[PDB]
Each structure stands twice: as C-alpha cells, then as structure tokens.
Ligand binder design. Structure first.
Ligand code: WDB
Ligand code: MG
Ligand code: ZN
Length: 301
C-alpha cells in the first residue's frame, strides 16, 4: 500500500521523456516504480484511459498487482520481460504506426496481454509444478492457459478492475482477444501458424479486413514483441542473453551459436514478414540482423 501511495501520487512523465517510443528502449536503469509509470503512459498515450474511463487508482493497483505476480527469482521470465514486451507493443503501435489498423478493443487487449502473458512463470526448469497440477494434461499450451488464468484473476480482483468501464459486450470481446493473444505466445502455436502468415504476405494476399487474418496478425505481433529482446542494441542483447542463459543453465561458450540458430529458426522471418506489413517496423528487423552478425562473429571464435 506504501508502493501504491507513491505510484498514484507521482506525475507521469511524457512518452518522449520515458523513451518508450523507441524500439531500442531498455529498462536496466529504471526502478520498479519507474516501470510502472511508463506502463501508465502506455495506457494513456494509446487513449485507453480516456476511451474506457479508467480510474487512476484502479489502473495503478492493477499494474502493481501484475508486477507482484511475476517472480523475481526467475532470471528472464519475470516482470521486466513482460514490461519490455508491452513497451515493444506500444512502440509497434506508435513508432510503427500499426495503431491505425486496429480497433480500440484490440489495442486494449494487446497491451493487457503483453503485460500479463507470462504471469507467475516459474522458470523453464521448474515445469514440475504445472505437472503436480494437471498430472493428466501433461501429454496443450499448459503454461499460457495458466498465464491467462492469472491475468483474469487479477482483472477481477477488487480495486483492480480496469475494464469495469466496458460494456458486457466489449468485455467479452476484449477477454477473447486477450486470451488468444496470451495463448499465441506459445512458440508451438507460432510455428504452427506462421506458415500461413508468410505465404499470405508472399502472395500479396494479406488482408486485415479478413477476421481470420486480423487474428493471425495479432498472434504474430504478440510473438514479435515477446521475442523483441533479440532486436535490441548489442549491449542490451548481450545482457538479455546472459539472463536467458542463467534461467536455462543455472536455474535462476555455447551461447553465440545458440543465439544464431534461434535468430535463424524463429526470429528473422517473423520480423521480415512484419516489415512487409509495415515498413515502419523495420528497426526490429534491422536490430535483429545486427545481433546475428555480432553473435556469429563470436561463434566463429
Ligand atoms: O517465452 C519468452 O518469453 C521468450 C523466449 C525467449 C527469449 C529470448 C531467447 C534468446 O535470446 N535465446 C534463446 C535461445 C536459447 C535457448 C536456451 C539457452 C540460451 Cl543461452 C539461448 N531463446 C530465447 C527464448
Ligand atoms: Mg510465455
Ligand atoms: Zn514471454
């Protein structure tokens, strides 16, 4: 409650001041409270506070509840990863001008989903807890369903209901988009569905007015921001790879070639496709290409 008193009383600096419009954004120098103020600015500058009549105190309480339900003893899959994913979504909507291709309910759900998509992640080497639970459902996007459960629980918690200003129809619609968006962060679903996305772009058939292609695009965008650490400037990306390695190996050199393979198999084609959708998202592809060059030079020793 003392952290809530400081956050609700602080003046939120502008998006430019907070540098959240830049694809190169990094959070290493920010306090936890500073990350919360940037998150308020994301809601504010996307007009989510205005169009959906969000009480200031409820938004702050919701942001702090989301933050507290990430585990800091997890080296990468923590609150800062979710905060950065949301920042990339904000930068993609603003700096990439994607914002005008989507409705307010879709933008509202994407921001919420980005912030919530990894809630209560226990670390890649602690998947035994989600097996003590659901001992039969182990051989399903097991974790992404749990992440949405966590998100929904927080959205419904007293004093935390940032969607109370929505009508019941807008709420059901928003909840559905949130659910699909969080579930899309399952890389298996990404690999399963990315092929249809690429051929649509390749054949120049990509149609945002198609309800199926709009949903497909929302999934790809969630993956793009989820993995956006791979696009950051070289000093940032080196630090993130350190965090990924700690969670993976130390439950908290082979890394260069692992990063190059990850860029090739997963990342490069997605950011290539996204630039065909909007050339203003090119910095993500450019940053990813530069990082591959750096890791590959190290990989060759
Ligand atoms: O689920 C998420 O939130 C995002 C996931 C993710 C993010 C970054 C990365 C990333 O840099 N590299 C790699 C490849 C990798 C795998 C294992 C150890 C290392 Cl040292 C590197 N895999 C990654 C996976
Ligand atoms: Mg995840
Ligand atoms: Zn994630």
């Amino acid at each position: 409650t003392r952290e809530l008193q400081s956050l609700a009383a602080a003046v939120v600096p502008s998006a430019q001041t907070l540098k959240i419009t830049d694809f190169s954004f990094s959070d290493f120098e920010l306090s936890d409270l500073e990350t919360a103020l940037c998150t308020i600015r994301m809601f504010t500058d996307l007009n989510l506070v205005q169009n959906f009549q969000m009480k200031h105190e409820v938004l702050c309480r919701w942001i702090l509840s989301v933050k507290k339900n990430y585990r800091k003893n997890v080296a990468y899959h923590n609150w800062r990863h979710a905060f950065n994913t949301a920042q990339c979504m904000f930068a993609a909507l603003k700096a990439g001008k994607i914002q005008n291709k989507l409705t307010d309910l879709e933008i509202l759900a994407l921001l919420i989903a980005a912030l919530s998509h990894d809630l209560d992640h226990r670390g890649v080497n602690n998947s035994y807890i989600q097996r003590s639970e659901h001992p039969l459902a182990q051989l399903h996007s097991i974790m992404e369903h749990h992440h949405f459960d966590q998100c929904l629980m927080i959205l419904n918690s007293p004093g935390n209901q940032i969607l109370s200003g929505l009508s019941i129809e807008e709420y059901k619609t928003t909840l559905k988009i949130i659910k699909q968006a969080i579930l899309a962060t399952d890389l298996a679903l990404y690999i399963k569905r990315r092929g249809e996305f690429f051929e649509l772009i390749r054949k120049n058939q990509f149609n945002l007015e198609d309800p199926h292609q709009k949903e497909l695009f929302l999934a790809m965008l969630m993956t793009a921001c989820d993995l956006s650490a791979i696009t950051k400037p070289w000093p940032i990306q080196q630090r993130i790879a350190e965090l990924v390695a700690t969670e993976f190996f130390d439950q908290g050199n082979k890394i260069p070639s692992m990063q190059v393979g990850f860029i090739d198999a997963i990342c490069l084609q997605l950011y290539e496709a996204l630039t065909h959708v909007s050339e203003d998202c090119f910095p993500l592809l450019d940053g990813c290409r530069k990082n591959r060059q750096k890791w590959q030079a190290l990989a060759e020793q």
